[PDB]
Amino acid sequence: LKQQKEIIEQGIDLFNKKPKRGIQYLQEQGMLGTTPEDIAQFLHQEERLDSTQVGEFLGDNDKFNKEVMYAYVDQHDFSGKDFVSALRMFLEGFRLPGEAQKIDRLMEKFAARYLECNQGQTLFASADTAYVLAYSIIMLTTDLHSPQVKNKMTKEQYIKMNRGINDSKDLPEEYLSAIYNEIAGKKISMK
Ligand SMILES: [Ca+2]
Ligand SMILES: [Ca+2]
Numbered sequence: 001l002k003q004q005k006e007i008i009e010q011g012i013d014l015f016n017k018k019p020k021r022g023i024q025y026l027q028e029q030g031m032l033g034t035t036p037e038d039i040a041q042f043l044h045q046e047e048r049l050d051s052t053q054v055g056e057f058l059g060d061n062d063k064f065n066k067e068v069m070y071a072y073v074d075q076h077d078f079s080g081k082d083f084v085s086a087l088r089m090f091l092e093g094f095r096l097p098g099e100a101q102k103i104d105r106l107m108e109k110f111a112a113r114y115l116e117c118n119q120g121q122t123l124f125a126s127a128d129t130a131y132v133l134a135y136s137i138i139m140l141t142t143d144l145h146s147p148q149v150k151n152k153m154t155k156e157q158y159i160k161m162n163r164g165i166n167d168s169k170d171l172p173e174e175y176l177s178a179i180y181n182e183i184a185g186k187k188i189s190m191k
Contacts, residue, residue: 007031016050019057036064040071044093051190054094059102066105073109078117084182086114087134091188096138107134125169133171136161137179141188155180 001007007029015022023039026032032042043054058069078086090110096103111130115121124130136158143153159176 004029004031012046012048016053019053036067036071037075039068040075043068043072044075051095052097055097056102058094059097059099059106061101061105069105070109073113076113078114081118081121083114083123083130083133084137084179086110086117087137088188092190095190103135103138107131107138110134123171123175125166129166129169129171132162133179137183137188140180140183144184145187 001010008026008031011022011026011029011031013022014025023032023042026042027034032038043049043058057065058072060066073090076086076090078089080086087110096106108127108131111127111134114130114134115124115127124133139161140153140158143149155177158180159173162171162176164170
C-alpha cells in the first residue's frame, strides 16, 4: 500500500520472514536509516518484530550484523551493580538463538557492556569473569528449567562451572549460591 504507517507494518512483516529483507525494504522506502545505530534503535522500538528472528539477526556473524548488535547492546544501561537483573533486562528483548557460537558473541558483548557500566564495581576481575558467569547462567536456566534434563544441575555442580584457571579472578561461592537460588526460583524469561 501507500501510507508510511502501512509501509512500516509491511517491513515488520517481511522482517519476520527474513530480517535483512525487512530492513532493506524499509531502507528502500525511506523509513529506516542505514547506520548500525538506526537498525539497533528500530530493533529496540518495534515490539512486534518476532523474538526469534531478532535473536538470530543479533547473533549472526556477518560484519554488519555484529555492528548492529554492538550498537544494540550499547543502547542498554546496565548500572546498579546487579548482574542478573542486567542480564534479565538484556534477554527480555528477544529470544536467545540456539547456535552456541551466537550465544557466545551475545554473552561476550553483554559482559563487556556490563563492566563498562559498572566501573567502580568490585566482584569481576575481568570481562572474562562476567562472560563466563553470564554463560553459566544461560546454561543453568536451561538445565533447571527444561524438562528434557532429568538430572538437574546442582548448586555444587554450578559452582564448578565457575572455576579455573583464573583462581582469584574467581567468584565467592556464597555469591554463586545466591545466583543459583535466584535462577532456580525465577527462570530467565522474555514475558
Ligand atoms: Ca534487549
Ligand atoms: Ca531469552
